[PDB]
Amino acid sequence: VRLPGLAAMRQGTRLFTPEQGEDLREALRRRRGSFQTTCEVTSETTFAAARRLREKASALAALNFASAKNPGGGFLGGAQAQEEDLCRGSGLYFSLTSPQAEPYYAVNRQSHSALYTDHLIYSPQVPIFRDDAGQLLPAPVPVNIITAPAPNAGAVAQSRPEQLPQVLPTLRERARRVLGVAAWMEQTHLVLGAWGCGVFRNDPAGVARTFRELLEGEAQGAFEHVTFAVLDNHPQHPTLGAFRRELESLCLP
Numbered sequence: 001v002r003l004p005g006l007a008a009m010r011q012g013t014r015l016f017t018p019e020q021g022e023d024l025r026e027a028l029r030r031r032r033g034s035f036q037t038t039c040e041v042t043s044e045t046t047f048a049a050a051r052r053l054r055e056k057a058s059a060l061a062a063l064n065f066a067s068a069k070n071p072g073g074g075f076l077g078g079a080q081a082q083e084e085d086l087c088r089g090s091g092l093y094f095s096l097t098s099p100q101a102e103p104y105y106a107v108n109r110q111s112h113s114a115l116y117t118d119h120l121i122y123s124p125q126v127p128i129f130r131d132d133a134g135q136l137l138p139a140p141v142p143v144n145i146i147t148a149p150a151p152n153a154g155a156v157a158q159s160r161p162e163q164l165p166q167v168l169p170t171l172r173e174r175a176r177r178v179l180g181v182a183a184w185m186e187q188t189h190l191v192l193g194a195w196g197c198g199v200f201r202n203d204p205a206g207v208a209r210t211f212r213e214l215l216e217g218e219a220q221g222a223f224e225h226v227t228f229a230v231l232d233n234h235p236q237h238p239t240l241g242a243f244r245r246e247l248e249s250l251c252l253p
């Protein structure tokens with residue numbers, strides 16, 4: 001049988017096209033300053049942090065460090081990707097494959113460009129069925145998921161180095177659209193993290209700086225709470241450390 005929650009989530013899945021960029025900037029603008037935003041950096045998975053936020057989050061959203069060209073990443077390379085962790089534990093794949101999200105994949109593929117495009121998919125009330133360990137949750141917990149691909153900085157470096165000056169501007173403006181989806185959908189709690197910093201090989205300090213700059217500027221006080229849940233099993237914890245250091249000025253009471 002189709003799992004509970006899936007049908008309603010798929011039918012409510014929505015595409016944000018690049019032409020919505022100003023609508024997202026306006027939504028951020030209208031919401032800036034609403035709260036004293038609290039921030040934190042944790043070493044949790046995206047869904048551990050979401051499940052810990054749920055009970056006291058009015059509208060909870062999380063970022064999917066998405067593939068531009070295949071729902072769920074096509075399930076290639078293994079279980080170190082965040083997006084495959086999301087599709088393993090939740091109904092997200094059933095949303096990403098929806099007919100209305102298909103332009104995101106078709107256009108990004110048609111771009112023949114490792115910066116990808118400014119399409120974003122919004123997936124309402126995605127049910128989380130399992131925890132990090134794969135055990136069945138007694139009750140699925142719903143989360144709203146924003147799907148956006150960071151620029152593929154590894155592929156720029158190796159395949160089209162004349163786009164190298166475009167990686168950070170791309171990352172910066174698309175991070176702006178992610179927050180703008182969240183503000184347009186009037187989300188209070190956001191689970192962010194090291195978007196683009198593994199398979200896509202973006203620089204962790206650069207990505208956390210870009211989220212810092214936005215949460216101190218255009219998106220300042222637009223959200224109740226922001227969690228940078230940064231899973232990092234590398235020996236020196238360089239990703240988690242880069243986020244912790246770069247986001248120490250924001251994560252203050």
Ligand SMILES: Nc1ncnc2c1ncn2[C@@H]1O[C@H](COP(=O)(O)OP(=O)(O)OC[C@H]2O[C@H](O)[C@H](O)[C@@H]2O)[C@@H](O)[C@H]1O
Nearest residue numbers: 045046065066067073081082085194196197198199200231
């Ligand atoms: N469940 C997790 N939760 C939180 N953080 C995680 C998790 N898993 C990894 N991280 C950390 O977050 C960092 C980034 O996670 P990555 O998945 O590489 O994001 P990208 O945007 O650079 O690659 C996206 C591509 O890879 C996928 O296949 C997509 O389909 C795309 O094709 C990791 O280094 C971890 O430290």
